[PDB]
Ligand binder design. Structure first.
Ligand SMILES: CC(C)=CC[C@@H](O)C1=CC(=O)c2c(O)ccc(O)c2C1=O
Lengths: 299, 299
């Protein structure tokens, strides 16, 4: 049974604050005596291109309002770093979890805490796609919503701050250093993301899960090695496949090698027509190897 | 766009405890000075039908261990209520949320906090199906994982305690009064659940959601009334559609009555023609009316 899940959100909920500047409202993340939020909060109300360097120089501390569960925090100073602000506040978050900052790469899964006016309203897992966007569920007010993973020892990795929705509906964020993923611009524009590629590492994990669930009508006995598959992948909307030995736990059971699965992918690439795999009508790239192993065996 | 989300889990994480009896270990829920957990924890280790009234009679309080974050609570007394135990402990949970207990009905959505040895590991939303099972992701140790909903006022409704995985992989739980949903037996046996029906109320919500995204190739211009659809639903594995009242918010913004959607369901009943609606190739009964409204409008 494969169910997309989120890791528990309680320790991140204690770090979400409401950040207001003039009339603009979004979410920030409060760690120690620092609040990080998108710099969109200081943007003037206008249609034209925003000049964030100008807005930053004309910024006044007293125009800020930062609160946690209605309790307001004093603003001491502010600095700009790419597309985020670092707001120093007059008290430390005593519920700051043990944490680090990590930048995500395409193929990485993580957790989104969807927040409105500094209040979490939902949590879900997502994958950073090859075009550096995610498929979230956001409405007006979710700017600054955090993305995170919890490591095995309980260290939270903060990796994402929601910034903007593109015209196609794809969602874009930044890391906590202020780099926008995919280097989109953090203001409204006509930018379009590149084509989505199917994450081959996730498709392999998916097919190993199908095998462990007695679903093997689709198995090919042909073998395609990694170099060959990677060459085919370029021609057909798939990423290269990373490695084989990560899957050797899965190849010892099932008895099927990664190269048989790679051959299977090339065979199923058209579609399953008249059949499904684990209830899916086409190849699923939603789940990582880590997810499959964790949800199946608790590792 | 429609994504299955959970409500944040922080307030429920602080209620989850590790209940041990002899060598048997599972999860419990600590509210005030009561821990509620499945009665399987006092089952003897055996491959025969378990007589729970006898196990309850031979029970000894000193055999229990109840802990939170490796901190042990004193057990004061235990009573049995259907498939659950209520363990009184000598400490009250100081983080007990404002809460009620609620029994789910088929078609209700809720949140699962999946737990192992008293520690939350994942959170996901699910839907109670017509055969009173859910499709979750649980492995050994998950029993006693709680399901919940959070109301507008912040009241947590506790509605589910995970009990058992069936032969088909479907999951069975009880409410906090001890009744097993669907009256399955809370122990190993060969029980098979009756087949599932399509929740028409949810399918209608999902088609309104598609209309709000411009996906409307599927729209029938014709109409069927409620009585005709329900007669059709009986003979095709669909639930009866409720009323047309609830969909006022959606019928108003779409200008599409429920009767047109019921007609569209009959047409789309078999086959989308290879085509697609919001990422699905067949109709979807996983989203309720309330979920669609909250995700499109925040209400
Ligand atoms: C004792 C016998 C040899 C097998 C028991 C196993 O099947 C089982 C494990 C379990 O952990 C559990 C619960 O936690 C809750 C209800 C429930 O029936 C169960 C179970 O039947």
């Amino acid at each position: 049974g494969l169910k997309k899940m989120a890791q528990p959100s309680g320790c991140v909920e204690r770090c979400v604050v409401r950040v207001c500047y003039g009339s603009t409202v979004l979410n920030g993340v409060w760690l120690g005596d620092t609040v990080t939020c998108p710099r969109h909060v200081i943007a003037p109300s206008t249609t034209v291109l925003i000049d964030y360097d100008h807005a930053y120089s004309t910024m006044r501390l007293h125009n800020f309002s930062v609160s946690h569960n209605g309790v307001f925090l004093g603003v001491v100073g502010v600095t700009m770093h790419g597309s985020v602000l670092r707001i120093k506040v007059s008290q430390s978050n005593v519920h700051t979890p043990k944490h680090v900052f990590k930048t995500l790469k395409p193929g990485d899964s993580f957790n989104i805490l969807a927040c409105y006016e500094g209040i979490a309203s939902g949590v879900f897992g997502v994958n950073l796609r090859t075009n550096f966007t995610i498929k979230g569920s956001f409405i007006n007010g979710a700017c600054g919503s955090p993305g995170y993973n919890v490591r095995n020892d309980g260290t939270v990795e903060f990796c994402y701050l929601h910034q903007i929705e593109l015209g196609s509906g794809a969602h874009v964020g930044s890391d906590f250093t202020g780099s926008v993923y995919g280097n989109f611009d953090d203001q409204p524009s006509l930018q379009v993301e590149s084509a989505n590629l199917m994450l081959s590492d996730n498709v392999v994990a998916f097919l190993y899960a199908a095998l462990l669930n007695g679903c093997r009508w689709w198995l090919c006995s042909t073998r395609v090695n990694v170099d060959g598959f990677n060459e085919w992948a370029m021609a057909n909307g798939y990423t290269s496949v990373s490695s084989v030995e990560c899957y050797s736990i899965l190849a010892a059971k099932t008895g099927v090698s990664v190269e048989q699965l790679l051959a299977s992918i090339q065979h199923l690439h058209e579609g399953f027509g008249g059949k499904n795999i684990l209830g899916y009508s086409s190849l699923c790239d939603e789940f990582t190897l880590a997810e499959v192993v964790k949800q199946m065996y608790g590792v």
